[PDB]
Each structure stands twice: as structure tokens, then as C-alpha cells.
């Protein structure tokens, strides 16, 4: 309903140069954490909104483990599908540590962005 404001993403809330500086601080202060932004896909109509956007993920966590963590945060039932996408592809089969996903996939601003949805392509 146009009665309500549109959902704004992390990159709309914080400028590139702000995000850059935020990641510079995290990398110095928490060197073994990966800085991850997790957001619901803009067109998603089944899954609820996440109660946190910016996560400091220990670098040894793998994607199977991260999927369980976000399904838990969202309080999903086993009947609900959930897909976690990085740059247009699904993370379920990655299983390398998130340290390697960061190195391959991180944004120019230094955060690793993920989008979740009830389907794999969208």
C-alpha cells in the first residue's frame, strides 16, 4: 500500500564512504570477524524481516551453519523454505568457511552482502 513508506536497504541508509569507514574499523577491531549485511529480498512476501542487519560472523563459520543461525533468528518452522543468496547465487552448497566467501564475494565497500528469500531465483 502506498500509504506506507518503502523499505530502505542498508546501502540506502549509509553512504558508500560511511560503509567503507565502518568496515575499516571492524577489520582493525575484530580481525577474525567477517562483516556481513543480511537483508530480506525486496520482493519477498513469505518470510519475515530480520531483527538485525549487520553481523560480525566468526571467520570459521560455514554457510550450512549460517543458514541455521538465520532460520533461527527468523523463528522459521521446518515447513518454511529459506534461501541465502550472495551476488546472484545460492549459498547452501558452499560449505567453505565464510572467510573464503568474503574473499570471493565482498562488496567494494568491504561488507559481504547476503539476501534471503523463499525462492532461489528472483
Describe, in short, the structure shown.
With 122 residues, the chain is an alpha+beta fold. It has helices at residues 10-13, 16-29, 63-73, 98-105, and strands at 33-40, 54-58, 83-86, 89-90, 112-117.
Describe this protein's structure.
The chain starts with 9 loop residues before the first helix and ends in a 5-residue tail after the last strand. The protein has one domain (1-122): Ubiquitin-like (UB roll). The longest helix is centred in the first third of the chain and has 14 residues, at 16-29. It is α+β, with helices and mostly antiparallel strands. A hairpin with a 2-residue loop joins β3 (83-86) and β4 (89-90). It has a five-stranded mixed β-sheet. It has helices at residues 10-13, 16-29, 63-73, 98-105; strands at 33-40, 54-58, 83-86, 89-90, 112-117. This is Microtubule-associated protein 1 light chain 3 beta. Pfam families: ATG8. It is a lipid-anchor.
Could you say what the CATH topology is called? Ubiquitin-like (UB roll)
Adjacency order of strands in the biggest sheet: 2-1-5-3-4
Strand composition percent: 15-25%
Can you identify the CATH superfamily?
Phosphatidylinositol 3-kinase Catalytic Subunit, Chain A, domain 1
Radius of gyration, in angstroms, nearest whole number: 15 Å
Shape: globular
Count the strands?
Answer: 5
Range of helix content: 25-40%
Task: Give the second-level CATH assignment, the architecture.
Answer: Roll
Question: What number of structural domains do the residues give?
Answer: 1
Q: Looking at the chains present, what oligomeric state does this protein adopt? A: monomer
GO biological process, one term: cellular response to nitrogen starvation
Family: Belongs to the ATG8 family.
GO cellular component, one term: autophagosome
Protein name: Microtubule-associated protein 1 light chain 3 beta
